[PDB]
A paper describes a structure:
We show that scaffold assembly requires conserved leucine zipper (LZ) and Cnn-motif 2 (CM2) domains that co-assemble into a 2:2 complex in vitro.
SEC-MALS analysis revealed that LZ formed a stable homo-tetramer in solution, while CM2 behaved as a stable homo-dimer. A splayed C terminus was also observed in crystals of CM2 alone, indicating it is a feature of the CM2 sequence rather than being driven by the interaction with the LZ. Zn2+ was not included in our protein preparations, so it must have been incorporated into the dimer in the bacteria and then retained throughout the purification process, indicating tight binding. Addition of EDTA to WT CM2, or mutation of the Zn2+-coordinating His and Cys residues to Ala (CM2-HCAA), prevented dimerization in vitro, confirming that Zn2+ plays a structural role within CM2.
Residue numbers in the entry:
A (entry chain A), B (entry chain B): 1082 to 1140
The structure:
């Protein structure tokens, strides 16, 4: 048994295990931001139609 | 340290690392097939946006 190496390996595994989770969280939020972005798009076009309609109402 | 406890923790760290990797693999594979299903819809949407983009060319 290598007491120095096993403590070092556990520190390496724990450190990297944390690196892995935070990478996913970033991705999760990134996907979360992307989906909400395309959600807005459907409403933006609907909004644009209303404006254009209101513009042509003024006649 | 505690050689018995640290080795058991080391086995736990590797174990948890395997679950995360398999969790990613599960997600990736599920996502890979899922994207292929929605892919026809996505190109159709891209075309209408592109078409509408082309419509606004009039100046
Ligand atoms: Zn030891």
């Amino acid at each position: 048994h290598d007491c120095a190496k096993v403590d070092l390996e556990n520190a390496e595994l724990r450190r990297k295990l944390i690196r892995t989770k935070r990478a996913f969280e970033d991705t999760y939020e990134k996907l979360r931001m992307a989906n909400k972005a395309k959600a807005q798009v459907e409403k933006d076009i609907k909004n644009q139609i209303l404006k254009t309609h209101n513009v042509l109402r003024n006649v």
